[PDB]
């Protein structure tokens with residue numbers, strides 16, 4: 197017997213080698229039929245053995261082409277039609293852009309040619325073809341063409357030229373084609389070294405030195421991830437970091453030794469997008485100082501020819517952290533890196549190919565049955581987000597402050613930028629401004645309106661106000677909810693749960709623990725945490741014991757052991773400044789709530805970076821169904837007093853309960869009261885769609901447990917997946933809100 201199916205794939209499917217893929221996996225499972233493009237995405241007709249079609253449907257479902265963004269797959273039964281063969285058939289929809297693709301990791305064919313001793317490009321560190329290599333990182337302008345890339349200064353040799361022009365070659369119109377004879381080459385700076393440049397880097401790593409490596413999107417810093425001393429000297433030389441290091445490993449087998457790797461996680465690792473994937477550790481096997489006191493590790497695989505070559509010369513994982521002092525934009529030019537990283541790196545691996553657009557490594561993960569991206573950069577940007585509704589007019593969304601991205605709309609596309617970083621330094625600002633001009637140029641966008649955060653002290657806000665265009669201001673947490681709404685094409689009233697550290701509220705106070713009823717044009721504040729004073733504002737976020745004190749300010753005597761640990765003079769002044777309202781904001785913030793908890797139970801008195809106590813509190817928790825009592829009090833809106841929950845936490849602490857146990861109980865309390873609020877709002881409003889966004893949802897337990905709880909009570913639950921739930925996704929939300937305000 198023979199079985200026949202008709203398959204529709206909706207989403208971004210062009211420009212990603214999807215059709216040649218379908219053709220190949222057709223010859224694989226020996227199937228007959230056709231594939232072609234349509235307006236919605238792709239059309240497939242397939243017939244053959246029942247075991248081949250279910251597997252075909254699985255390969256498309258489980259490992260589709262890396263650069264594709266599949267939104268929906270539909271399968272219907274159809275009558276057998278007896279096809280002779282399989283064909284890639286054309287359509288009026290053929291040649292459907294996007295003009296600029298993300299940078300791509302080395303493809304399987306280039307890998308095999310890199311490792312083939314008989315191949316002219318054997319060991320060539322800049323090998324690429326039509327299906328891989330640098331794209332965005334070297335592109336100045338459009339249409340995509342060598343002359344409009346940093347490859348224009350290299351004249352092609354004969355051998356590369358005929359490959360480029362041969363329509364049946366895998367390097368046909370491969371713009372950055374190269375070989376040893378005509379292409380870029382590597383250089384080694386530092387101490388003398390006789391060998392080839394990769395071997396030198398291997399030697400330097402082996403000796404416990406820091407190597408600055410020029411990759412695709414910029415420079416990165418590497419040491420031997422098994423060498424405690426080398427990791428320690430990098431920690432000392434950055435000195436202002438604290439953040440965990442990402443690590444590069446040679447293959448999935450090596451990852452499975454250090455981390456838990458599910459199939460979806462393996463798909464993200466092996467993807468040509470090649471991101472860092474945050475993974476659960478399997479027992480401490482790496483050096484101290486990589487990712488201490490945390491149960492997760494960011495792992496990436498090789499992505500450029502240089503890494504594959506490096507991997508056969510070393511037998512240890514390597515730290516691969518951004519090439520910057522502190523946290524400013526990473527270096528991109530040779531001379532810029534040699535100066536900026538002089539006190540960090542011992543040696544450098546350079547090359548003579550300009551990086552035009554610097555772009556950081558992406559950082560992603562898998563949780564609650566979907567990809568949850570933390571930092572959307574190399575391999576993802578500058579691919580647009582697909583919108584169901586055509587945008588009325590072109591909007592520039594300037595984003596926010598932390599982990600900034602900007603966003604431009606045109607047609608059915610939201611062109612969100614790659615991760616820019618914190619807009620709090622000259623270097624970040626230039627990078628930002630510069631890249632706005634580049635995106636405008638690459639995607640032919642001329643913005644008519646500007647959307648910005650309500651906060652007046654953001655560089656992004658100041659920039660918006662400095663432009664000569666109508667301005668729409670957007671509340672921070674509304675933009676979080678909306679950013680998720682854009683992903684899932686929602687355009688109706690939802691229950692929006694916006695939990696994060698901070699964002700300017702419409703009442704003038706800090707928000708970040710809000711339940712909103714909102715659509716794309718407006719919102720209503722329905723619920724938040726009871727305001728507590730944050731004495732010293734910014735300082736209290738580093739010294740989180742101050743946040744604790746702010747939360748417990750009207751009930752100091754209850755927390756005897758904790759308050760007696762604080763210097764008496766400081767305590768007096770902290771308590772007086774709250775009374776006199778000096779340098780003190782009032783906050784409704786999930787990030788601060790967590791910080792207070794962390795401080796009270798001796799996890800952390802002071803943090804090296806924002807969110808450290810939040811991440812550690814999550815890592816140390818035990819398995820527990822238990823939780824703390826809470827009262828939902830109805831005032832002007834629905835409010836919960838965090839101090840009443842802190843009371844019980846401190847009690848448990850004083851009785852000698854484990855931090856692991858208390859952390860778990862706290863996590864369940866937030867989940868439980870949030871669920872209870874969501875039910876109250878649904879009961880009043882009739883709204884059954886819930887959106888979860890804001891940085892707090894980077895917490896795996898929080899997101900997972902809440903999606904489960906709400907789904908099991910009939911909620912239709914949505915959270916970020918294509919853009920981050922952190923401030924990296926804000927711009928997308930700003931854009932869709934601005935569009936909706938214009939529309940009517």
Ligand SMILES: [Fe+3]
Nearest residue numbers: 696699891923
């Ligand atoms: Fe935020």
Ligand SMILES: [Zn+2]
Nearest residue numbers: 303306325328
């Ligand atoms: Zn290739």
Ligand SMILES: [Zn+2]
Nearest residue numbers: 353356375378
């Ligand atoms: Zn050549």
